[PDB]
Each structure stands twice: as structure tokens, then as C-alpha cells.
Amino acid sequence: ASRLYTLVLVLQPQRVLLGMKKRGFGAGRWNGFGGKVQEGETIEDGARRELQEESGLTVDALHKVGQIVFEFVGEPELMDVHVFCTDSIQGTPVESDEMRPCWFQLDQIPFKDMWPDDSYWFPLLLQKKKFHGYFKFQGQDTILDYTLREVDTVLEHHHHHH
Numbered sequence: 811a812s813r814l815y816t817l818v819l820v821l822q823p824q825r826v827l828l829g830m831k832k833r834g835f836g837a838g839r840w841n842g843f844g845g846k847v848q849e850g851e852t853i854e855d856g857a858r859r860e861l862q863e864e865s866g867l868t869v870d871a872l873h874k875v876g877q878i879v880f881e882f883v884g885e886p887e888l889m890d891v892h893v894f895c896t897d898s899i900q901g902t903p904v905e906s907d908e909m910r911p912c913w914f915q916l917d918q919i920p921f922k923d924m925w926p927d928d929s930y931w932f933p934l935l936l937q938k939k940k941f942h943g944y945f946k947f948q949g950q951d952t953i954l955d956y957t958l959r960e961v962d963t964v965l966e967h968h969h970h971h972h
């Protein structure tokens with residue numbers, strides 16, 4: 811029982827581009843750019859689509875930095891989140907109806923305004939290290955338990971529908 815998602819972090823030496831959910835689910839929180847991988851699309855096309863729709867940005871390449879598994883108490887279906895980062899972007903960041911991109915200096919990242927798991931794996935991301943992580947949520951604000959480990963290479967899931 812799982813659903814397939816992507817998350818894209820736009821990362822430059824001194825700054826990260828985040829985006830603010832403007833309405834609906836998760837409104838008021840800054841996040842990377844991502845969403846559900848659609849049927850008929852590959853993981854990486856979905857990551858590119860999320861970034862393009864939400865930030866208006868195109869990228870030359872995505873690095874696979876991480877895999878996050880979310881579990882929500884009472885829900886049997888896990889979220890399988892493929893995490894990517896990109897250094898080199900093309901276009902000017904512009905908001906959609908869903909998301910507004912904004913640059914943040916790395917030491918200014920607004921963790922109180924982001925999802926609670928970000929405080930865990932963001933240090934590994936900014937150190938340019940790959941990771942695998944798991945977070946058990948109760949509601950939106952509460953992590954019941956977590957496992958986070960640095961990895962040498964991101965484990966490939968061999969999704970053959972995506």
C-alpha cells in the first residue's frame with residue numbers, strides 16, 4: 811500500500827528556492843516543489859512537471875538525493891517520496907495558483923513554517939549527502955517516530971509503471 815510522489819529542492823550555494831502553498835492542503839507552509847506522480851508519467855517527468863507548474867522553472871538535470879517514506883496513523887497507504895535536488899535552473903521563478911516561489915538564505919530556512927520532517931533531513935541535503943528516511947505522522951503537525959540514515963547511493967525502486 812503506497813502512493814508515488816516527488817519532491818524537488820532548488821539549491822544554490824547560499825540559497826534555496828522554496829514555495830509557499832497558497833491555499834488548500836498545507837496552505838501557509840513552505841516546501842520543496844512536488845506532488846503525486848500521475849499514471850502514464852515517469853517519476854522524473856513528474857518531478858519536472860511539478861517544478862514547472864509550481865515554480866515556472868525548467869532544469870537541465872535532477873540529482874537523486876533521497877528517499878522519504880511517510881506513514882500516517884490509521885492510514886494503511888504509505889507515501890513513497892522520491893527526493894531530488896537541482897543546482898542549475900532556467901527561467902524566472904513565478905507563482906502559480908498553488909505555490910509562490912521565494913529564495914531563502916540557507917541559514918534563514920523557516921523550519922517553523924515548513925513540514926516537521928524538514929528539520930531532520932535538510933541538514934543532510936545541505937551537506938550534499940544522500941539519505942533514506944521514514945516519518946510516522948499523527949495529523950499534520952506531529953511526528954510519532956522517525957528513522958533517518960545517510961546512504962552512499964539512493965536505492966533504486968524499479969517502478970515499471972513510472
Ligand SMILES: COc1c(O)cc2oc3cc4c(c(O)c3c(=O)c2c1CC=C(C)C)CCC(C)(C)O4
Pocket residue numbers: 815816817841843844845846880882883891925926927928947948949950
Ligand atoms: C514533502 O512534503 C510533505 C511533508 O514534508 C510532510 C507531509 O506530511 C503529511 C502528513 C499528513 C498528511 C499529508 O498529506 C502529509 C503530506 O502530504 C506531507 C508532505 C507533502 C507531500 C509532497 C509534497 C509529495 C495527510 C494525512 C495526515 C494524517 C493529515 O498527515
Ligand SMILES: [Zn+2]
Pocket residue numbers: 848849971972
Ligand atoms: Zn502508478
Ligand SMILES: [Zn+2]
Pocket residue numbers: 821873895896897
Ligand atoms: Zn543537487
Ligand SMILES: [Zn+2]
Pocket residue numbers: 814890891892967969
Ligand atoms: Zn519509489
